[PDB]
C-alpha cells in the first residue's frame, strides 16, 4: 500500500489527531473538558456516574 501526501499551501482537510494535554491532578489548574472551562483541583472520589 503506497500512500501519497500533498503539501500545497491551502486549507488542509486533514491534519491529524488534535493533541490533548495530560491529566494534571491534585493541583489548582485551568481545565477545558469540551467547553467546560474554569479553574479547579482535579481530584477523584467515590461517586457513581450514569
Amino acid at each position: 500500500v503506497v500512500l501519497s501526501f500533498e503539501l500545497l499551501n491551502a486549507p488542509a482537510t486533514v491534519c491529524g489527531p488534535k493533541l490533548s494535554t495530560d491529566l494534571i491532578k491534585n493541583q489548582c489548574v485551568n481545565f477545558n473538558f469540551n467547553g467546560l472551562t474554569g479553574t479547579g483541583v482535579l481530584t477523584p472520589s467515590s461517586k457513581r456516574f450514569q
Partner: antibody, heavy 122, light 110 residues
Framework: QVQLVQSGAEVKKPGASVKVSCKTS????????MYWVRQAPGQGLEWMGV????????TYAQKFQGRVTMTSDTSTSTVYMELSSLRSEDTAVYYCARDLFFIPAANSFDYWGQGTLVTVSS | EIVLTQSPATLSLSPGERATLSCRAS??????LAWYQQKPGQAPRLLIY???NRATGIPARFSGSGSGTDFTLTISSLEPEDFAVYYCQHRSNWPRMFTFGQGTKLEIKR
C-alpha cells in the same frame, strides 16, 4: 492531441479584477497539475501557480499571495485565474501549461497553451 | 529560494556547431533541472526534463548533462529552426516551488 485554448485580449483598469480562463481538451482532465506563467516584456516569469483541478488545493507564490486567486471546474474542465490589484508592470501575455507528471508527483511543463495578452492602461 | 545565475547569457554560433548553454544554481541543488525552448513569438516548448531524460518529439541532436552544480546543454547539430531563447527551470522539494532562470539568446553568427 493535447491542446490548451485560451481567451483573447482583455484590457482592464488599474484597480479592477481580471478573469482569464484556460480551456483544456484532448485528454482525461481528472489527474493533472495545472500551472500558470506570464512572460513580461524583457523580463522573465518566476512563480509556481499550481492548482489542483480535482481537489480544492491551491498554491501561490511569495510576491503574489493575496492578489491572485484561482479556481477549477471539474464539469467544464477549465480553470479560472482572478488577479486583483493590477499593477503597471504585470501587463504581459499570460500562459497556462500542464505538467509532465500526475498530481502526487511533479515535473516540468510539457503542453503549453496559446497566450492571453492582458493590458492595464488607458 | 534558490536563484539561477547565467554568466554567458548569450551564444552567437553558426548552424552546424555545438552549443555551450549553461545553467548554474546558487546552492548545491540536486539534478532536478529542466531546460526549455521558446521561439520568439510562439509558445515555449520542453527540451530536456530532469536533466537526464529525453522528452517526447525532441530529436536526437539535443542531449543535456550536469550533476549538482555544473550543468550544461550540448547540441549535436544546430538547425535553422532551433535558434531561440532557452530557459532552465529549477524546482524545490518541500514547498512545491519552481524557479526559472534568465535565458540565453542564440543568434546565428554572420
Amino acid at each position: 492531441q493535447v491542446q490548451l485554448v485560451q481567451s483573447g485580449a482583455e484590457v482592464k483598469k488599474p484597480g479592477a479584477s481580471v478573469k482569464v480562463s484556460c480551456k483544456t481538451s484532448g485528454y482525461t482532465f481528472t489527474d493533472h497539475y495545472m500551472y500558470w506563467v506570464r512572460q513580461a516584456p524583457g523580463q522573465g516569469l518566476e512563480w509556481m501557480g499550481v492548482i489542483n483541478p480535482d481537489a480544492g488545493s491551491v498554491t501561490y507564490a511569495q510576491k503574489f499571495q493575496g492578489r491572485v486567486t484561482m479556481t477549477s471546474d471539474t464539469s467544464t474542465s477549465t480553470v479560472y485565474m482572478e488577479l486583483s490589484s493590477l499593477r503597471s508592470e504585470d501587463t504581459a501575455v499570460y500562459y497556462c501549461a500542464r505538467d509532465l507528471f500526475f498530481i502526487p508527483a511533479a515535473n516540468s511543463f510539457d503542453y503549453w497553451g496559446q497566450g492571453t495578452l492582458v493590458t492595464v492602461s488607458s | 529560494e534558490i536563484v539561477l545565475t547565467q554568466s554567458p547569457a548569450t551564444l552567437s554560433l553558426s548552424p552546424g556547431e555545438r552549443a555551450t548553454l549553461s545553467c548554474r544554481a546558487s546552492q548545491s541543488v540536486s539534478s532536478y533541472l529542466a531546460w526549455y525552448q521558446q521561439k520568439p513569438g510562439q509558445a515555449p516548448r520542453l527540451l530536456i526534463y530532469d536533466a537526464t531524460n529525453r522528452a517526447t518529439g525532441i530529436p536526437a541532436r539535443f542531449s543535456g548533462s550536469g550533476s549538482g552544480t555544473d550543468f550544461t546543454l550540448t547540441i549535436s547539430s544546430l538547425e535553422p529552426e532551433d535558434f531561440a531563447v532557452y530557459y532552465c527551470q529549477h524546482r524545490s522539494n518541500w514547498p512545491r516551488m519552481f524557479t526559472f532562470g534568465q535565458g540565453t539568446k542564440l543568434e546565428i553568427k554572420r
